[PDB]
Amino acid sequence: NTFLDTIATRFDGTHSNFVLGNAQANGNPIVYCSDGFVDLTGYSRAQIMQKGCSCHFLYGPDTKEEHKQQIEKSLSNKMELKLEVIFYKKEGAPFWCLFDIVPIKNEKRDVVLFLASHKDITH
């Protein structure tokens, strides 16, 4: 199977919140998102499928600038990131998110995807 299919399938049945971004396309576009991520954020899959893995569409007033920078650098340098950051749902409700990005490499050791997952840690 392809990397996109293979990675998504790994999480079947876990009800995880995650997206897959295409690292070989400008802007690192989201090319897949789980049902859990749809429910978490309040955005439809259709809306999410026109957004970037940086998850800029989740930024709001209290989203720290330094956190936005960390995310940009992670994606730009194609490196891992584990970050506690305030994100905003579709209707504006804020939530604390543990944002986890890992670069996915192919058989040639080239980064072809980003796996980015989201844990609601507002608790």
Numbering used by the authors: 12 to 134
From the publication, what sentences describe this entry?
The KCNH family of voltage gated potassium channels includes the EAG (ether-a-go-go) channels, the ERG (eag related gene) channels and the ELK (eag like K+) channels; these channels have roles in cardiac repolarization, neuronal excitability, cell differentiation and tumor growth. The N-terminus typically includes a Per-Arnt-Sim (PAS) domain, while the C-terminal region includes a domain that strongly resembles cyclic nucleotide binding domains, but which has been shown to have little affinity for cyclic nucleotides. As already stated, the role of PAS domains in KCNH channels is unknown; it is not known if these domains bind small ligands or mediate interactions between the channel and other proteins.
Crystals of dELK PAS domain were obtained after applying a strategy that involves methylation of lysines and removal of the first 10 amino acids of the protein. Analysis of the two dELK structures in the asymmetric unit reveals the absence of a large cavity. The lack of a preformed cavity in the dELK domain, at the same site as in hERG, appears to result from the presence of several large side-chains in that region. A large part of the volume is occupied by the side-chain of F110 in dELK, which substitutes the smaller valine residue present in hERG (V110). In dELK a histidine (H129) replaces the cavity lining phenylalanine present in hERG (F129). The absence of a cavity in dELK leaves the histidine side-chain buried in the domain hydrophobic core surrounded, within 5 Å, by the side-chains of several apolar residues (V30, F48, L51, L69,F98, F110 and A127) and two cysteines (C66 and C108). In contrast, in dELK the hydrophobic patch is not involved in crystal lattice packing. Interestingly, a superposition of the dELK structure with the Δ9-hERG PAS domain through residues in their β-sheet reveals that the N-terminal helices occupy the same relative positions at the center of the hydrophobic patch of each domain.
